[PDB]
Every structure is written in C-alpha cells, then in structure tokens.
Amino acid sequence: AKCVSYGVAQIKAPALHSQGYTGSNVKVAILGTGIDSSHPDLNVAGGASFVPSETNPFQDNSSHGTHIAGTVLAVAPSASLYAVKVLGADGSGQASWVINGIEWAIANNMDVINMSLGSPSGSAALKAAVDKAVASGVVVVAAAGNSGTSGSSSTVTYPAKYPSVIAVGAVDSSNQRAPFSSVGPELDVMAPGVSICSTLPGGKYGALSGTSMASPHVAGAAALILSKHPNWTNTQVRSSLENTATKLGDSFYYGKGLINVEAAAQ
Amino acid sequence: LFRAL
Ligand code: NA
Ligand code: NA
C-alpha cells in the first residue's frame, strides 16, 4: 500500500508477511460503493453493480469502497478484490441491493465478504442471505455500526447484528474504543478504525474513520489466515480470530478485543 | 436504507 497506515502493524499483519503469507489465492468481495479500478495501486478481478443509478462497479463516486479495498490489500497484498456495488455515491442503498450482492458473492465462490455498511433494521431475507453465505463456507465480516452508545441497549447495525456475521468495532491507535463505534453483546472483535490512510478515487490517498475502516482489517486478516491455512473452514477462521484476540475491556464495548492475526494464524 | 459506515 502506498499510504502508510498504523493499522496494519497494530493487528500484527507484518508478522504474517515476514512468514511469507500475503493472502494469495483468496477472493474478497468488497460490498459497497464500488472500487476505482483505475487507481494504480488497486487491481480488481471482477465485480457487479446492483445500484440502478450507478451501473459501473469499477468506479466509485463515494470514495469509501476504494478506501476499504485498499485496506484489504494493505493487510493482504496478494488478495483478489471483487467490486460489488450495493450502495450509491451518497453511501446509501436498498436492502434488496445488498442481498443481491451477497447472492452474487456466493455464486461467484468468494472466500470472504466485507460489508462496511449497516442499517438499524435488517430483514428476514437479509438474514437468510448471510446465513446462506456462511453455510456455503464464506467468511462474512461486517462493520458493527457508527451509532455510538445508547445506554444498555445494543447499537450494533444489521447485518453485523446477525449471529452468523463477524461484527467488528473500531479502536484508535491506542486500542481505545472510538466514540462512534457501536456497542452490544453482538460485537465480536475490534480493529483500527480511526484516521486510516488508504486509496481514494482518482489516484489519491487519505484518512477516513469509521467501523467501515475496521471491517476490512478483519477481512484482510481472514485472507492472511486462509493463505496459511487454506483448508480451515469459515467457522475455524472466525474462531481463530475471536479466540486469540487481545482483550481490551468489557465485551459489550470491545467484544473479544483487538484482532491479532499473528496469533490467529498460529 | 443501508448506509456506508
Ligand atoms: Na488499477
Ligand atoms: Na454478528
């Protein structure tokens, strides 16, 4: 990755890189606003758009998909990226579009799905789609939400709120929970999500913040893990990440804590 | 709606 970001080191990805593991032969679907395939540092292997007003998945008129894609590659430089456009330029999309993108990912034999997106409500159909993906062997990772806290209530968004999906909250460089990061018993793990520098459309770079930024660290970590252990099931990859996380505090706020890909891939 | 986080 051409923009330096602390998050890669924080999750202990360089340790895998030094072992020789970079996520080769792992197909990662980036479900979001598209990916700018013209960026010189991003190669996109395939994709599809489900946003009727924005028909090209290989451009990104938001910036977030491009950024996220870059973070997956910063963590897993050999991963194969697929651009699955389910949100428009303003970051919004319809439930059905998301589901369409999930279906696409299952049909095209994705290894990992990253969903840096959320709604305060889901649907039985969305639950069925993610549960089908998990039954099919896909590692399914989602941003936990940017709804902060709500007393004792969970503020984790869908689809992260569904049990079959790995729900990823955001910490800063000091492992403190970001003020925006959603909370609740559905949180699984945390990853860097504050001022993360990555690729932007038009050959640019810059920092963004959000649980959107934390999710691709975990998607990239899953790619690293699968490169070292291509026979592990999605269940085993998930267990590896959760069981070896660095505990940070109360699980309502932090889940199992910060992912440690070095430990997870042992 | 779903939204980018
Ligand atoms: Na390119
Ligand atoms: Na979940």
Numbering used by the authors:
A (entry chain S): 1 to 74, 84 to 275
B (entry chain B): 276 to 280
Quoted from the paper:
The engineering process to develop specificity for the RAS sequence QEEYSAM involved extensive modification of the Bacillus protease, subtilisin BPN’16–24, a canonical serine protease in which the scissile peptide bond is attacked by a nucleophilic serine (S221).
Based on this analysis, as well as earlier engineering work, we designed mutations in the catalytic region, the S1 pocket, and the S4 pocket to create a nitrite-dependent (D32G) protease and an imidazole-dependent (H64G) protease. These are denoted Protease1(N) and Protease1(I), respectively. The structure shows the enzyme complexed with a cognate peptide (LYRAL) and azide bound in the position normally occupied by the catalytic D32. Overall the structures are very similar, with an RMSD between Cα carbons of 0.17 Å. The structures also provide insight into the structural basis for cofactor activation by both nitrite in Protease1(N) and imidazole in RASProtease(I). In both cases, a catalytic amino acid is mutated to Gly and the vacated space is occupied by a network of conserved water molecules in the absence of the cognate cofactor.
